[PDB]
């Protein structure tokens, strides 16, 4: 499939609250690209300390959201929607580079992730793209992932 | 429009009970349109329900009441952070609420409330909660503002 | 078939969990008819951080939620008796809420007692009505219709 | 007064969520004894891990709620209900002795703290008593605290 | 039986979970005799939100709780070694606490070290005593008796 | 003027609070040059409930965040010294992040030590780089360019 919801996401990613930062997958093309998003609301614990009186979604959390989206792309590209194989694999990031923050993300924003496969070889996948809010580029980054066997 | 920081200056509700993220339309003594983003990154989803995230219906109603409260605060004293800060809001009655579609993470929960009747601190509103243009809930409620 | 259940029994029947399991103990239960339960209210609850600062007030919507869960427990055990194995894959949806009226603010230190009576039930759809009480007085009235469903 | 509610407790004790363990004061005789309580509900964070499937209010937290009542007694005995002076004081607990746990406390219980002044000399206060659920003693302990100036 | 266990091993032995599992690593362990472990203290802990605002202090009573869990880890590995299957069926029960002294306040940035020795033990009943240390100084002392039991 | 600071001081300088204040103590500080600081890692942190169940690992992006806050403290104190009053009218933001590499997983029990060096500064624009260490071993490295902005 090309569109996935939280329930499908929960079966692929090992991340859970309060570290699962992807709510829905709206577009996915194997070995090419993924478009996913996370809704930003004031009702998140993170906003108690970032910052009091001034809610701003952490930039590092935006990058984390892009990573999870990218790992979802890499994983589903190879094995598709397979919850089983998913429990036997782990996708952790080795590097991150070219990260730029252009606009602050706040409650009410739909943080949309746009990642594409720059290149991949074996279990090493390199993705890149931007985070967008209402069509505008809020952030950008490149990440290298390593897919390994859990345990 | 009114963003989260403005809402914070009028409504007394704080985390984890501030369920309105933005005000898109406001017409004193008439209606108000606002919304709250729904994300998995919310603590309530740990218990409602595990392995099956569904935004609580009562919280949908709470969001509508808060939206109505904002309409009440501003229709009464305009945008006045000073008066606001001494008040709190109390739910008085809730009636005729119907839930049609479950709200889950990824949804933009939009509130549409019109004033049905008001007097002093006591306000009665009614409207709907919508997701992508569809009515996911309807409700009527009466709230009271106080010191 | 029992009439008194504790938190351990409530956990095996209701799907709700922290921070949305708002029933602490069942004090009386008559199958297909009524139930009496309660939830203790303490400052040591996260909802109080924002409702409101310096003025802790148990939300009215959460009182109604606590009443619905009471009805849910009643609905399930009246249906399959006390069977956690059947219960563990069931969820509960709110369908409607009517005639709610709040009379007295519930605060930390209150023992919120739920009194629910079955008004009408058909299969998975149960319509209960009753009150929430603190120290023998009505703090809230409510009528609600919920549906029990298998996790699909 | 003799009955202080959560709002009065908030103005005297510095403790806040999730460490304010006294919900209401029912009895208070200056320089002698205090009776208060904290409700025990499942809707508390500590139950997430103490213990999963077996909700049991931690024994050490019963003692804390007992110490907190003592602190309230001591403070009110010295200056009465004075929130302004309250902000300038510290009740540092020095010791805890002879603690016995007889019955487990669980969601649905009304934990009643019963403390009395065993000895008061200068800035040092020694209180002792029991914790009770429905008339039955579930715990007992002795505590010594020092009154001082915050900073 | 190892002598140094990490969080992953502790999770498999003790029944405690967040936010009540107050032992991060086991450094030294000698069956039926003594144990050395520690819990890292960081500002990023919910408990500091209220104890107290603008001046984080790790609650003395939690320092004692931490000492108990270390003793509980000793007690169990002593009677059953590293055995998660049997451990999963139990909980630790506090029976008594004595001679606890709080000498030095514990703050974020501190590595809270637990030092306990078996004063007495019979079956599931264990009596340990010792100190809590930060950078070699004693910040707290205590004696306690716990009991391991079936979650029946 | 000082090279050592504890959470009390860190709170007066950084606007970050729970659950995003990720620096517990500063052990070495040198105006316009470098800073050495750390954050203790403990299982008792909310982040571990979801990252990941049964396998607690401190998020790599949070390590970077910790390095950034450290750098930010460095930048500010380098320009105004320990001045709480002015600190509360300013805020350091991340403009860019580069050359980030994760070498070793960070887990409960670890002392995450931040090592930041000032690569270039000119006014409110600061560029730092360095590593995060555990037991003297590099667990991560990164470069950041920040901006000391007006909070209002
Ligand atoms: O119960 C009390 N405990 N206070 C202890 C306490 C200990 C530390 Br050392 C501290 O930093 C702060 Br502030 C306290 O309030 C209390 C403190 C002041 C006035 N009335 C009651
Ligand atoms: O292994 C890493 N990430 N996550 C690992 C991981 C996650 C889950 Br869940 C799991 O079951 C296993 Br075994 C893992 O290794 C990693 C690798 C290098 C640096 N930091 C983190
Ligand atoms: Cl940021
Ligand atoms: Cl619902
Ligand atoms: Cl209310
Ligand atoms: Cl205990
Ligand atoms: Cl303490
Ligand atoms: Cl990571």
Could you tell me the CATH number of the domain that includes residue C48?
Answer: 3.10.129.10
Contacts of A43 (CB under 8 A, 6+ apart): B15, B16, B18, B19, B36, B42
CB atoms closer than 10 angstroms to residue B31: 16
CA-CA distance, F87 to F82, in Å (whole number)?
8
3 state DSSP class of A55: coil
Specify the residue with its C-alpha closest to ligand 2, atom 16. Answer: F105
Tokens linked to F35: 């800073």
Cβ D68 vs Cβ D93: under 8 Å: no
- CA max distance for chain A: 47
Shortest CA gap D114–chain C (Å): 16
Q: Provide the β-strand partners of residue B69.
A: none
Query: Chains A vs F: touching, with 3+ CB pairs under 8 Å?
Result: yes
Of E52, E99, E151, the CB nearest to D15: E52
Is position C60 annotated in a ligand binding site? yes
Distance CA B55, CA B66 (A): 16
- Tell me if A78 CB under 6 Å of ligand 2: no
CB neighbour list of residue E30: distance below 8 Å, 6 or more residues apart: E3
Query: Which of E:91-110 have CB within 8 Å of D?
Result: 91, 93-102
CA–CA dist D34, A86 (Å, integer): 58
Residue with tokens 């007394």: B12
> Mapped to the 3 state alphabet, what secondary structure does E35-60 carry?
EEEEEECCCCCHHHHCCCCCCCCECH
Q: What is the resolution of this structure in A?
A: 2.4
B118 is catalytic: no
Closest CA to B85 of C46, F88, C53, A49: C53
Mutate to test the interface with A, among F88, F89, F98 (most CBs of A within 10 A): F98
Cβ within 8 Å, pair A23-B36: no
Q: Are A25 and A51 a contacting pair, CB within 8 Å?
A: no
The residues, any chain, with a CB within 8 Å of residue A50's CB and separated by 6 or more, are A56, A57, A58, F16, F17, F20
Contact C95 B94 (CB under 8 A): no
Name the residue of chain C whose CA is nearest to B94's CA.
Answer: C100
CB E41 within 8 A of CB E58: yes
CB contact under 8 A, F61 and A67: yes
* Distances F40 to A96, E61, F49, F61, F134 between C-alpha atoms, Å: 24, 21, 17, 16, 10
Distance CA D86, CA A17 (A): 39
Atom number, ligand 1, closest to the C-alpha of residue D86:
19
The rounded distance, in Å, linking the Cα atoms of F46 and A33 is: 32
Q: Which token pair is C92?
A: 């509960």
Q: Is A90 in the pocket of ligand 2 (CB under 6 A)?
A: yes
8 Å CB contact between B137 and B100: yes
| CB of C63 closer than 8 Å to CB of C106 | yes
Which among B20, B69, B94 is the top mutation candidate for probing chain C, defined by the most C β-carbons within 10 Å of its own β-carbon? B94
Asked if residue F60 belongs to a known ligand binding site, the reply is: yes
F window 30-89, beta carbon within 8 A of E: 38-49, 54-56
Nearest to E64 by CA among E148, E147, E140, E149: E140
β-pair partners for E134:
E137
Rounded Cα–Cα distance for residues E140 and F117 (Å): 38
Catalytic residue selected from D8, D15, D50, D120: D50
Identify which ligand lies nearest to the alpha carbon of E91: 6
Q: How far apart are CA A100 and CA A126, in angstroms?
A: 17
Q: What is the dihedral of CA E58, E63, E69, E72, to 10 degrees?
A: 180
Compute and round to an integer the Cα radius of gyration of chain A.
15
Chains that touch F (3 or more CB pairs under 8 A): A, E
- What is the distance between the alpha carbons of residues A37 and A113, in angstroms, rounded to a whole number? 5
Query: Distance (Å, rounded) from C-alpha D55 to C-alpha D46?
Result: 9
Contact yes or no for D75/D67 (Cβ under 8 A): no
Record: contact D39-C11, CB cut-off 8 A: no
Question: Which ligand 2 atom is the nearest neighbour of the CA of F53?
Answer: 9
Mutate-to-test residue for ligand 2 from F100, F105, F134, highest number of ligand atoms within 8 A of CB: F105
Residues 6+ apart with CB under 8 A from F37: F23, F24, F25, F26, F27, F28, F70, F73, F113, F114
Chain C residue with Cα closest to D19: C44
Pocket residues: Cβ below 6 A from ligand 1? D 12-14, 68, 71, 75, 86, 89-92, 150; E 52, 55, 57, 105
Q: Whose CA is nearest to atom 17 of ligand 2?
A: F105
Domains of chain C: total: 1
Burial label for A2, CB within 10 Å (0-12, 13-18, 19+), is exposed
Instruction: With beta carbons less than 8 A apart as the criterion, state whether B66 and B13 touch.
Output: yes
What is the signed CA dihedral for B49, B52, B58, B64, rounded to 10 degrees? 140
User: What are the chain D neighbours of C54 within 8 Å (beta carbons)?
Assistant: 7, 10
Rg (chain E; Cα; Å): 15
Q: What are phi and psi of A129, to 5 degrees?
A: 160, -145
Contact between chains at C8 and D42 (C-beta distance less than 8 A): no
Distance CA E72, CA E75 (A): 5
Instruction: Please state the residue numbers annotated as binding site of E.
Output: 60, 103
For residues C54 and D7, is the Cβ–Cβ distance under 8 A? yes
The label of the residue with tokens 């920081």 reads B5
**Nearest ligand atom owner, CA of D46:** 6
Pairwise CA distance, residues D74 & C45, whole Å: 26
Find chain D residues with C-beta within 8 A of C10's C-beta.
Answer: 42
CA atoms of C25 and D109, how far apart (whole Å):
9
List the domain range (segments joined by +) for residue B85.
1-147
Reply yes or no: is the peptide bond before residue B16 cis, omega within 30 of 0: yes
Query: What is the atom index within ligand 2 of the atom nearest the CA of A151?
Result: 13
Give me the sheet containing B31-37, strands edge to edge: B22-27, B31-37, B108-119, B122-131, B134-146, B88-99, C90-102, C137-150, C125-134, C111-122, C34-40, C25-30
Contact B58 C57 (CB under 8 A): no
With CA atoms as reference, the chain B residue closest to C144 would be B97
Inter-CA distances, C59 with B58, B69, B94, Å: 10, 15, 13
Residues with Cβ within 8 Å of residue A45, at least 6 apart in sequence: A18, B15, B16, B41, B43, F19, F46
- Residue F118's φ and ψ, nearest 5 degrees, are -85, 105
Q: Cα A70 to the chain's mean position, in Å?
A: 6
CB contact (8 A) between residue D6 and residue C56: yes
The H or E element containing residue A10 is helix A6-12
Q: How far apart are CA B127 and CA B10, in angstroms?
A: 21
**What sign does the CA torsion over C7, C8, C13, C14 have?**
positive
């Amino acid at each position: 499939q090309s569109q996935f919801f939280i329930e499908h996401i929960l079966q692929i990613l090992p991340h859970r609250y309060p570290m699962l930062l992807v709510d829905r997958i709206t577009e996915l093309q194997a070995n090419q690209k993924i478009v996913a998003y996370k809704n930003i609301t004031f009702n998140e614990d993170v906003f108690n300390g970032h910052f009091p009186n001034k809610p701003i979604f952490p930039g590092v959390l935006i990058v984390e959201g892009m990573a999870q989206s990218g790992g979802f792309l890499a994983f589903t590209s190879l094995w598709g929607f397979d919850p089983e194989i998913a429990k036997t694999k782990i996708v952790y990031f080795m590097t991150i580079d070219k990260v730029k923050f252009r606009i602050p993300v706040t409650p009410g924003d739909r943080l949309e992730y746009h990642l594409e496969v720059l290149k991949h070889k074996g279990m090493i996948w390199q993705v890149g793209g931007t985070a967008q809010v209402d069509g505008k580029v809020v952030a950008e980054a490149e990440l290298k992932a390593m897919i390994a066997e859990r345990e």
